[PDB]
Write a protein that binds this ligand. Structure first.
Ligand code: HEC
Ligand code: HEC
Lengths: 129, 129
């Protein structure tokens, strides 16, 4: 495989998510009024999350459920469904990036939330309590 | 104000570099003959590197030279030149992604090395030996 050890695959997927959470939260902060809204920065954040959302799936190689991971082994008993959720995260991220082109705020908030729903949705099922 | 703590920016940039190295190295492996060349996979790897290359600069905030980092203190004293090199990496990584559209290996190899020199060039000056 691409990764020399499972720890390399675990580290890879964790970094992809961590970089994605940093960029996603900055959009949330702008939407929730915590910091000023900047369209250019918002679209940059959208670009980042979309590109980042394409990385972590590769990290979920088989046999990487043990060790320092928050991934539940149920990911690989239902890998078909897990991949589907990840593909949806990408589609929802791609939609958010398109919305960031327009300055309709109610369109930005809802397309943002459809992504947030992906984050929470997959975590509830496949990430340790 | 994006990062609550200095440790968060250090982790952010370190993760970006890590994910870029994984994808960039797979391009070298195909170009250098370690693994077979796949045009489609090459372009995906190029896409990842181009997007990943736009992330780490944000991480180099003030006061983040202390702690568990490989960044030298000279980066901030020479921040103008450091930013220019990073923006150059972004430009070169974007150039590599454009090359992957071409089927010319002599261009693919050449554009890959212009990115490779960006990595080595900045490490020699701005990363602890
Ligand atoms: C399933 C298809 C997921 C989607 C969609 C998102 N995430 Fe997730 N995330 C998932 C797993 C299986 C894990 C565990 C990784 C491990 O091996 O530990 C995670 C982890 C995270 C983390 C923690 C990463 C770390 O620092 O160790 C974060 C911060 C995170 N995920 C954020 C995140 C966001 C912001 C998402 C939407 C924008 C998102 N994830 C989607 C599974 C899945
Ligand atoms: C400066 C302008 C850089 C360019 C261009 C590239 N890298 Fe770099 N890299 C740089 C610094 C200052 C650091 C240290 C960051 C820290 O706070 O510790 C790094 C680190 C890396 C790492 C290690 C990441 C980790 O696991 O901690 C890797 C794997 C890495 N850099 C790779 C890399 C590649 C492949 C580059 C070109 C494609 C590249 N870097 C460019 C500074 C700079």
């Amino acid at each position: 495989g691409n990764f020399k050890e499972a720890d390399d695959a675990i580290h890879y997927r964790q970094s992809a998510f961590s970089l994605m959470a940093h960029n996603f939260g900055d959009m949330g902060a702008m939407l929730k009024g915590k910091k000023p809204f900047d369209s250019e920065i918002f679209t940059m954040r959208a670009e980042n999350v979309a590109a980042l959302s394409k990385l972590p799936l590769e990290g979920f190689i088989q046999g990487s459920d043990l060790g320092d991971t928050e991934a539940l082994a149920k990911i690989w008993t239902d890998k078909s469904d897990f991949d589907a959720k990840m593909v949806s995260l990408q589609d929802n991220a791609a939609a958010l990036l398109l919305a960031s082109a327009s300055d309709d705020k109610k369109l930005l908030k809802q397309s943002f939330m459809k992504v947030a729903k992906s984050c929470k949705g997959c975590h509830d099922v496949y990430k340790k309590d």
